[PDB]
Design a protein around this ligand. Sequence first.
Ligand code: ADP
Ligand code: ADP
Ligand code: ADP
Ligand code: MG
Ligand code: MG
Ligand code: MG
Lengths: 57, 57, 375, 375, 375, 52
Amino acid sequence: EAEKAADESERGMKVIESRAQKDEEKMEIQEIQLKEAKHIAEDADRKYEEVARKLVI
Amino acid sequence: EAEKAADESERGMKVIESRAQKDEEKMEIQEIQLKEAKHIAEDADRKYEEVARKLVI
Amino acid sequence: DEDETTALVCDNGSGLVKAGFAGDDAPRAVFPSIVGRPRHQGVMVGMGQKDSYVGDEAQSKRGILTLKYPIEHGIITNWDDMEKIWHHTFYNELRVAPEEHPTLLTEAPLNPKANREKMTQIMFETFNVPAMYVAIQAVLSLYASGRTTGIVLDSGDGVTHNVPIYEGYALPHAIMRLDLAGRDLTDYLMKILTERGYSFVTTAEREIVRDIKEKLCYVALDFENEMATAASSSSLEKSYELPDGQVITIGNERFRCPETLFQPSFIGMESAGIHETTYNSIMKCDIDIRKDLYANNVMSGGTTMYPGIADRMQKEITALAPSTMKIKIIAPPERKYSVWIGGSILASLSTFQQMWITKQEYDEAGPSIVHRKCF
Amino acid sequence: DEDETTALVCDNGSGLVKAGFAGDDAPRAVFPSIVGRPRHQGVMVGMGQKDSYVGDEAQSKRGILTLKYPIEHGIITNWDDMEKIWHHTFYNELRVAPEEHPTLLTEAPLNPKANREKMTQIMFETFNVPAMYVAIQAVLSLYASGRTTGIVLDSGDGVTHNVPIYEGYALPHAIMRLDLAGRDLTDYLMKILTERGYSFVTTAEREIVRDIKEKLCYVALDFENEMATAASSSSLEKSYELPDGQVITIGNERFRCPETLFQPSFIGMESAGIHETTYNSIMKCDIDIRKDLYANNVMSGGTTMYPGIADRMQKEITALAPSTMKIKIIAPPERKYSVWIGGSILASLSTFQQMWITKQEYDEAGPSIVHRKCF
Amino acid sequence: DEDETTALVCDNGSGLVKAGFAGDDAPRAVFPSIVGRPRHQGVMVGMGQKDSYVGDEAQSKRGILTLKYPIEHGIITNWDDMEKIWHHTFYNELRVAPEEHPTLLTEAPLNPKANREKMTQIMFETFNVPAMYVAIQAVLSLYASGRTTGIVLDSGDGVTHNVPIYEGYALPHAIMRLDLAGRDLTDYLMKILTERGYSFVTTAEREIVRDIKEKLCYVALDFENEMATAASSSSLEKSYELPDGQVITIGNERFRCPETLFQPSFIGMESAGIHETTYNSIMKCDIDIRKDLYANNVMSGGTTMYPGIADRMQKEITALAPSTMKIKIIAPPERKYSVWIGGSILASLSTFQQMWITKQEYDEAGPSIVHRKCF
Amino acid sequence: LGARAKESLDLRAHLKQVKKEDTEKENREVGDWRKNIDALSGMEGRKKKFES
Ligand SMILES: Nc1ncnc2c1ncn2[C@@H]1O[C@H](COP(=O)(O)OP(=O)(O)O)[C@@H](O)[C@H]1O
Ligand SMILES: Nc1ncnc2c1ncn2[C@@H]1O[C@H](COP(=O)(O)OP(=O)(O)O)[C@@H](O)[C@H]1O
Ligand SMILES: Nc1ncnc2c1ncn2[C@@H]1O[C@H](COP(=O)(O)OP(=O)(O)O)[C@@H](O)[C@H]1O
Ligand SMILES: [Mg+2]
Ligand SMILES: [Mg+2]
Ligand SMILES: [Mg+2]
């Protein structure tokens, strides 16, 4: 009985590890998306400042 | 041996479950931040384009 | 694919390929002209194991591939490479079949006539494009500027060309090609960085240092005075954050790299700076219109995104030429796409289909027909 | 035996032999690589009187046998020993005949080519395996991780190997073998326990002290500070119950034993810690991908069951390398079977039987054919 | 010390230091650039207990010392190491005081300018040399050959440099450095010997295997055909007697080790063989003189004592270049001293003291004066 | 960006699924079977042999 219980617990490990790893994949996806968004925003702000300076001149 | 293994697996249960829930929380935080960043990027694009049209004039 | 049979517009610029549909404002598929190949042989299985890698795929796989250039300064290495990259562009990137759309292409100035005949023949046999037209990028940049008078400085990645065109008329007698381009810039910067303590040979660092040129480089207003004040220059010295995370600091080199085009004697060219090449070009033609050439100079190319070319250009030409008339340069933002825009402009009007190079003309007269059909 | 002719999967790891059938999740017959020989001669009768003792039989008969290692750090002593242990594994432990099942084997990294040629020849002559394939354990651990990018730290019982593989491509130019392994760990612990008052030489106590390493050993977060606080450390000091029943107490030694791999100067190696060997390995290859290597490091081996390798690993690499990108180690539980799992993975797919090393190829080209058939 | 105030001539070649007096034919104190340090700490007394060990002392004490390289491929680790080794050379080996003799030094091609400024500053502060001059080893080897036209292949122990010089003029635009050198040779031979059954990591075996390279190594005329005939090759296979007395037999490896410089793809370099690097170097410069470069190529370095470089060199260049003009290599025996000989040649003439770098110039303009005083 | 993420995660999931296939094939037939010692009480005391 005890060994069977330990085996079902081992299956618990497997499926919870699967949950953790799918979560970690989504973590990488959304963090990369955040880097890309912030980099594009900064570049657009710099372009806006440059074109404002050009307009003034 | 079986009892100690089961107890070790219980410790793992709680550790990994918590890890997963924390990841889900992080997911939500990253999601709202990404939405805000996308909004800001669209804003900056619009601003720059309007300034460019005025510049061309 | 659009329901209409509109033409394909593809700029195979010396350094960048920009392709899309006619009637569009910007090219859809734009990629650098680098081509990666497996550095080693195949023993593994389950994924990859593909020979040609092009576009962003090769950009991501730069480290594992020998990075080779199918074209350098116009010279063609292997037509199979162009075959594969055009396949990729048309089907994997443009999602278009060339059967139902004629192609307008742009070629580097003064490209070999034998090169044109071979490329057109392999094209027509390999592909099934209905009709053809190829034009020099000079008149394309002219069209982007929309002014028939001016001298075009086309600064590609293999050659820099100076071409004068007055009232929409080419002047081949006053057109010149200079072997200074991005390649030289990277090389010179490589040797200076070697003298700064960092010595790399591979192409990944080539792209890193051209990115550095895109971001931080200056065009010195006065050269030796700026190195004299750049001796210490804590504020003037500028740093970059390399993707590995190390901070690499560069000072005078920022404006000592593009200066080499202006001062070729640094690495040994008989030809003087490109401003001298525009000057001689101008005087070769009749005196009178030269003033207009002074006032209507245009510059085109991806390099033009850098600062400092305009001020240096005008000041040196005014130093060389009399300062009575005012000289002013014109350069629209994002002009590296401008050539492709001009291609769309060519497809805009309804007279363009009068001189499409159809399949049957090539079948009748071979490739030789282009000798009479384009010029 | 299964009704199907599925292949044999056998990992002859340097320290453990794990054998079973293809399509299985875990190896069926797993035994340490110790071999016991009668310590004295025969005068008695009625039982025993058998030369070779392998597996759990020798584990039970450790005291009566001279315990010898047929392999140490890859070097082969006597092929007859492998012959007997493979006979035992196939027939007494796996209950399988190698006539009807091809064998996939894993070998220690950078094993001698002459060793491969002799072992394959004796194998083919002695046994009747239909087909063959042998692979490096590095790519097997990679397959177990299922990620084509990373640097594998294979910590066997004779050698520790650092091997970088980017996008499923081996990098032999940046692969190194270090002579520190379980043997060294046991030796160093033996001398420290000798300084603790307990001095043993025989192999039974070797297994006892490696069991102690499995159970109680630490990896010190800070070394000299932890011995300074381990001066008294009534709580931190830990005890073990030896099978004879005596209570043996050990304190700082728990984390002063694995530290020697990290600090080889304790017993005199020119090479620095294994983290330095991973560091140099990383920089030998192009700069750019190094960050990915930092973020994709994998560790494999039976030793990995100990705590403390992960935290020490990351902290020291972050100390050596810039701390911009986050470094994280991955290590699935029970990874010492992982190599064998990868072997099963190799037999899963239907392309694997395209390059089975059949009998007739070996009969044609001798052993030399493997020089062209594996690599 | 000579009664006359003649100058010091010191070649700090990348791999060997050769020092002596001006007007001498050969350097007096010649030692390899290895530096040994105590592998352990001090507890004994009565003898030894000295930190730095240099020269033949370290050669005799190789086993007890961690052997470290103060310079590798030009990069400088610790200036204190150079301080000590120069002290040893000047006083214990040359028995000379640098106060009364100006020094002529040779530096590796394209050495860092920051390296030059720091080394000169520490030199001038630490030492009391009256005057200074430092030159590139390329023109020194040219002087040893005594012919102003040719391309110099400097094969040091850290870098191999190809430098073209026409009519006694440097061509930096066509000069390249390749990271293949003795270190690579030893490494590659180490891995092949590992595949032969002998796996060593320490530096003593590094020196043993470089000695093997000095004695037995071939340069294969045809590569794959020679391994094909070297399959058995009882006569062609050659043996060495290691100082411990064991006989170590090597066959194809003799000509498979230097081949790696010619075939870098063996251990993964994008750059092709060094003959390609001489070829590209030649074409970079004007076409016309290229024939003279073909006919005037010179090779220099300690490695040049090996056979086979000349025949391979000429055959491959003739394969690459048209075979109209006859290509012939020149290489005087014992050319590793040749650079130092050229240093003596520099001190021979009475114009050399017009541009000695005196103490007061450095005191006025700091190290920066060398930027204007040498070049 | 979504295409890059999809390609990476799809390769990862492909290697994950190939790894699952081996576990799907068999999961229990790798372990050995039960042979514990118990009972035997009914056996006789005077063994037919003298190791009694
Ligand atoms: N956004 C950018 N900013 C600065 N330089 C750029 C940029 N994009 C491309 N370049 C430079 O432009 C060069 C390519 O020139 P290209 O535009 O292909 O010439 P052409 O106009 O003849 O096609 C590259 O070498 C690169 O260094
Ligand atoms: N359950 C365990 N816990 C801790 N250490 C173990 C365990 N099983 C084996 N080991 C250690 O692993 C070593 C054998 O390594 P091994 O896995 O054979 O290397 P490889 O991966 O190269 O085959 C043994 O010396 C032993 O000390
Ligand atoms: N007598 C010799 N025979 C063969 N090779 C030698 C001999 N002496 C030195 N070498 C090789 O020359 C290398 C050192 O090159 P070196 O002459 O210092 O280069 P450089 O000319 O740049 O100073 C050593 O690695 C050694 O292997
Ligand atoms: Mg251009
Ligand atoms: Mg292992
Ligand atoms: Mg040399």
